[model samples]
Target: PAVGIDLGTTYSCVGVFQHGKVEIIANDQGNRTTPSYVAFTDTERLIGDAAKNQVAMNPTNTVFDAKRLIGRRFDDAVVQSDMKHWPFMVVNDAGRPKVQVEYKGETKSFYPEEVSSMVLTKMKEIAEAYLGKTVTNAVVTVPAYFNDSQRQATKDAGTIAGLNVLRIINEPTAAAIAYGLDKKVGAERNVLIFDLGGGTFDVSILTIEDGIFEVKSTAGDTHLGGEDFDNRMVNHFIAEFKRKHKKDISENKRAVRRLRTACERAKRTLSSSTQASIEIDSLYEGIDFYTSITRARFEELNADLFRGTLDPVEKALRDAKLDKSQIHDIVLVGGSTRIPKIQKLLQDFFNGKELNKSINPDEAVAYGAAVQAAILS
Candidate 1:
């Protein structure tokens, strides 16, 4: 059985081809998706859940978004800017950005590629163990906009992880393949995939004919995603807190962490409810703040954020020579797409064509990669 891996910016997953079916391999935590995080503790190195659990307490030792860091120079504006804001230490070493960590009372450094390799290795081991076979071949998925350096870095990570990298497919293309394969019983179809992931957003227009999937065009903003939404919510909370406490809590790490957590929760709740509340205590050591926000209010406040996606959607349509009437189906992918306002916007833009939600947005890319691995093998 050959395995497939989706090394996502926020999460990672592995799957294998078996008996004409694709099976996702669960991580040590018994979850299909693992957090793309790593942490070095006083006693041991941790990945996934353990690292995510200690993020607020051990931000200095935990690293996130290694996917963006891999193969990027420290001097690159994106890398340098992200490094400055990242809780982990990122330094220029050998012309690459290396993550510095404190382990066993000593300072140790690891390239983003190395950390990603460790994650890939763990996924490979899981697949091999579950299938009771020595798995070596794999097809990995990357963001559509990943450049030559990023693609090469992904291949290198596979090499260091002891797997033969069979191919590197774009995440959107992989989704199209999986969707097309599953709907093979139908006639030829034209579809559009809107993927708003944790770290990026992509809109792809494709055609599926007789199991042959072709990506006609794609467009995206590499820097826009759920993280941006979280930031919006954080900013809103910052203003709200200031109004009540007469103090700004943005600079306080503990306050920021609490506010960020609340913001994330509120964002998720807004998906299904009209209103949500967030609470914080002693953000300034003497004040308590609680607030409730309506979904309509949130949408109003973040209208600009939603509008940012429209340009890329228009670009995809233009590139594919498509119009709302021509698009037979619309597929939504990614956690951020769970927002109800996003669905409403797409529905309005497409003239009420029902969007497809048949696939798990979070797991679709990994499952599609598995399907591709099966086909390539």
Candidate 2:
């Protein structure tokens, strides 16, 4: 059996085409999305949610967000930024970013493709389990702005995971296919796709007419997205913790890792609630910290980062030679687009025009990948 995969930096999804229809295949945990993480324990290795769950206690052994790290030089500005935030050691190896981990009481070096391969291998296993047979071929989705090196690295990961990659499709185009715009009959349509994942952001303009899809312009920051928000929350908590205990935990991986997980929880809570609380019992040095924050405060503290997304949107519009009136639809494509502040700002910018919410923001690209898999099959 063959499958389609949306290989995301923060999450990965898989599906298959069969009986003239495409259905997403969930991991054994029964979730459609899986965290892309790997952890090396003393005697063994873990992948996906199991690895992610160990992050707080084993930051040095856990690796996450390989999609952002893959096939890039360690000296790249974005890698530098992410490395500063990550607890694990990332160093230059042959001019490429490589993760340094300890397993079996020895230091081990892993290229980005190697880390990514662990994730791809898990997704492939899930597909094989669901398909009830051995699977060999797949079509993967990548960011629209991914360069040739990044795409090649992705394919390399697939190969390492023992899958024959049929093709890699642009994520935005995959999302469009999931939206069924190509199948709909219309004179012509112009749309914008704003994709904000955990670690990257993309703004693109595309047009479709008579079953033909065309990409006009694209802009993105490979290092900016919800990850920054998580960092902001972590820093805010650190500031609060310092005020309470006068101890710096910045260099303490365990403390920072726990704080990061708490910050992410608050980030998600604020998505649907007015306020979120951060309280960790005995966080560090026999000290407990407690704090409550409002969604308004989070938006205010990260206002600059929120505004940063607009620059790429404006740039993409300019590249497409488009005015707001010319765009027939503006689709929100990514997990971070669920943030109410982001949605409100984008709507307010377009003179209160609503964005397209037809497809599930989190899984749209994977659904489209399944369509591509069907087409290819």
Candidate 3:
């Protein structure tokens, strides 16, 4: 059996085609989606939720967002900017970025691809365990805007993880595939896929006709996405703490890590609820912190970021040389697309056209990859 893996920046999911259906394989913990986290301790290595759970305690050893650093030089502007917020140390290794951590009481260095390989291996294990077979072939998905170098690095990661990567498909393209856009038969349509994932954003325009899928344009900001929104919330809460206790907790790695986790949950809550409450015990200097924010306020905090997403949409449409009316379907892909404000903005931009929500945004890429993998098999 072959598998499809969505090796995401923040989370990953694996799927396999079986019995004429695409089934998303859950991990041993029964989570359909696994956090793309990797951690090293003195005795063992941890990945997925286990790694994410202990990140606050082992901030220096836990590595997330490896996707942002993979295939990039240490001196790259984006890498330098993310280094300011990353807990782990990143060192220059012959112009390449190497994540440094302490393991078994000794310092160790690992390339970003090595970090990604571990996550891919975890995804592979999930698929293999569920399929009850040794699966070797896979179709992995990447951002549509990924350059050749980054795509090659992702393939290298899969190779290291012991899978024969059959193809590296674009995330938007994969979502289109999962949506069965190519099965239009004699009909033809244009699609706009808006993907705002945990650590990256991509917008792509594709045309599907007669079992053919052609990408017309792709554009995105590699450094923008849910993580940036979380950072905004984290900084807000940090300021709120300082105003209450007159203590600066920004320099506290553990406290900041804990607050970041809380902010992420709060962000999710705000998506569905009008207001969300955030509480942290002993956030700083033995003082517990509590706060609440309205959805209106949350949108206010991220207004610029929310509005920024529309630029890429407009740019993609411009590059495709198609008008908004020419877009027959607008597909939303990525967990961040759950934001109600984003949906509203997209609706407003497209003259109130309803966005397609027929498919699970988080699992669509892997599902499409699974479809492709099944085809190859």
| Count of clashes, each model | 0, 0, 0
Q: Which stretches of candidate 1 lie over 4 Å from their true place?
A: 17-23, 41-43, 56-61, 72-77, 87-111, 128-134, 181-190, 241-252, 279-288
lDDT of 3 by residue, 27-46 (tens): 99999999999999999999
Superior by TM-score: candidate 2 or candidate 3: 3
Q: Is candidate 1 or 2 superior in lDDT?
A: 2
Clashing pairs in 2: none
lDDT of 2 by residue, 272-361 (tens): 999998888888887877789899989987899887888899899999999877877778888889889999888888888877766778
TM-score of 3: 0.85
Model 1: weakest 10-residue lDDT segment is: 177-186
| Candidate 1 collision pairs | none
For residue 64, model 1's alpha carbon misses the true position, in angstroms, by 2.8
Candidate 2 overall Cα lDDT vs. reference? 0.86
Total residue pair clashes for candidate 1: 0
- Lowest-lDDT window of 10 residues in candidate 2? 177-186
lDDT, model 2, position 291: 85
| lDDT, candidate 1, at 169 | 85
lDDT of 1 at 68: 77
